[PDB]
Design a protein around this ligand. Structure first.
Ligand SMILES: C[C@H](CCC(=O)O)[C@H]1CC[C@H]2[C@@H]3CC[C@@H]4C[C@H](O)CC[C@]4(C)[C@H]3C[C@H](O)[C@]12C
Ligand SMILES: C[C@H](CCC(=O)O)[C@H]1CC[C@H]2[C@@H]3CC[C@@H]4C[C@H](O)CC[C@]4(C)[C@H]3C[C@H](O)[C@]12C
Length: 159
C-alpha cells in the first residue's frame, strides 16, 4: 500500500532561480555544497527528462550507502519535479519505491515555498511512521539550506 506524507518549507530564493539551481543543476550542486550530506551524484542513463536514472551516494557512516532514483516528470513552467526512489538503501523486500513530488511556488517577498509529497509504496505490511520520515525532511532541509547559502553568496550563478 501507500503512505503519503506532505510538507512545506520556505526559501529566501525566488522560485525560478531555486528551480534552476536545486532541481536543474542539483547533480553538480549537492556534492559541492553539501558533501557531508551527499557524497556524489552519478548519471546512469538519460539526459535529465522522464526515465533518467541517477545514483545518489551518501557519506560513510550514514544509515544507507546509496539510492537510485528515476525522474518521472519535469515541469519547467510550473516548477514541478517528480521522481521515484527505485533501488538501494531502504528499497527491498518491505519497500518497493518512494514516489516524490516537489513544487516550488513564488511568494511576494521574493522568496519561495517548496511543497513536497513523499509516497512510500510498501510490499504489504509493514508501516512507515512520521517519526522515521523525519530523516527525509531533515536531509531535504539540509540540502535546501546549503544550496540557498551558495546562491546568496554567488549572485551571478543561475540567473
Ligand atoms: C533534488 C534532487 C533532484 C535534482 C537532481 O537530481 O539533481 C533529488 C533527486 C533524488 C533526491 C534524494 C533521493 C533520496 C532521498 C529521498 C528523501 O525523500 C529526501 C532526501 C533524499 C536524499 C532526496 C533529496 C533530493 O530530493 C534528491 C537529491
Ligand atoms: C524512514 C524511511 C522509511 C523506511 C522504512 O520504513 O522502510 C526511509 C526510506 C528512505 C530513507 C532515506 C533514503 C535516503 C537517505 C539515506 C541516508 O543514508 C539517510 C537519510 C536518508 C534521507 C534516508 C532516511 C530514511 O531512512 C528514509 C526516508
Amino acid at each position: 500500500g501507500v503512505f503519503n506524507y506532505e510538507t512545506e518549507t520556505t526559501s529566501v530564493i525566488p522560485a525560478a532561480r531555486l528551480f534552476k539551481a536545486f532541481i536543474l543543476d542539483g547533480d553538480n550542486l549537492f556534492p559541492k555544497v553539501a558533501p557531508q550530506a551527499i557524497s556524489s551524484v552519478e548519471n546512469i542513463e538519460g539526459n535529465g527528462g522522464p526515465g533518467t536514472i541517477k545514483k545518489i551516494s551518501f557519506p560513510e557512516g550514514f544509515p544507507f550507502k546509496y539510492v537510485k532514483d528515476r525522474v518521472d516528470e519535469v515541469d519547467h513552467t510550473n516548477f514541478k519535479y517528480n521522481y521515484s526512489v527505485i533501488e538501494g538503501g531502504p528499497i527491498g523486500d518491505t519497500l518497493e519505491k518512494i514516489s516524490n513530488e516537489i513544487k516550488i511556488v513564488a511568494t511576494p517577498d521574493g522568496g519561495s515555498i517548496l511543497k513536497i509529497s513523499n509516497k512510500y509504496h510498501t510490499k504489504g505490511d509493514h508501516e512507515v511512521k512520521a517519526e522515521q520520515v523525519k530523516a527525509s525532511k531533515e536531509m531535504g532541509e539540509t540540502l535546501l539550506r546549503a544550496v540557498e547559502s551558495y546562491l546568496l553568496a554567488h549572485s551571478d550563478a543561475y540567473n
